């Protein structure tokens, strides 16, 4: 809210197969996919807040 | 709030198709099949006009 926690990552592999430490993402919202199994996305949007 | 659209399909439809397939589908690869859960969901929603 008032001062949210920004972050970023780059130059590494990634997957929705690792998107959360519990697959029950109880506050999640995902135009890609929620935490479970996916592995095929990329962007200049390195942001990871 | 009632003008419906389809948000998930196993593939995009052919020219002028009017398919009324409406099952649950995988965000995680879970065979939820006739039932929803977190990571597997029904395919329709409507504009809040």
Swiss-Prot record, chain B:
Summarizing the annotation, the consequence of altering residue 36 to K is: In strain: Beta/B.1.351, Eta/B.1.525, Theta/P.3, Iota/B.1.526, B.1.1.318, Gamma/P.1, Zeta/P.2 and Mu/B.1.621; May enhance affinity to human ACE2 receptor
Where are the stretches annotated Disordered?
A: 7-42
According to the record, the residues making up region (Receptor-binding motif) are 1-49
Can you list the disulfide-bonded cysteine pairs?
A: 32-40
- Effect of altering residue 45 to R? In strain: Omicron/BA.1, Omicron/BA.2, Omicron/BA.2.12.1
Q: What outcome follows a substitution of residue 48 to S?
A: In strain: Omicron/BA.1
Query: Region Immunodominant HLA epitope recognized by the CD8+: what ranges?
Result: 1-8
Q: Mutating residue 12 to K has which effect?
A: In strain: Omicron/BA.2.75, Omicron/BQ.1.1, Omicron/XBB.1.5, Omicron/EG.5.1
Annotated consequence of substituting residue 8 to L: In strain: Omicron/EG.5.1
Name the consequence of residue 5 to F.
Answer: In strain: B.1.1.298
Q: Changing residue 36 to D: reported impact?
A: Increased replication in human TMEM106B overexpressing cells
> How does it associate, per the subunit comment?
Binds to host ACE2. RBD also interacts with the N-linked glycan on 'Asn-90' of ACE2. Cleavage of S generates a polybasic C-terminal sequence on S1 that binds to host Neuropilin-1 (NRP1) and Neuropilin-2 (NRP2) receptors. Interacts with host integrin alpha-5/beta-1 (ITGA5:ITGB1) and with ACE2 in complex with integrin alpha-5/beta-1 (ITGA5:ITGB1). May interact via cytoplasmic c-terminus with M protein. May interact (via N-terminus) with host bilirubin and biliverdin, thereby preventing antibody binding to the SARS-CoV-2 spike NTD via an allosteric mechanism.
Q: Could you identify this protein by its name?
A: Spike protein S1
Q: Which organism is it from?
A: Severe acute respiratory syndrome coronavirus 2
Q: Which gene encodes it?
A: S
Residues represented out of the complete protein: 449 to 497 of 1273
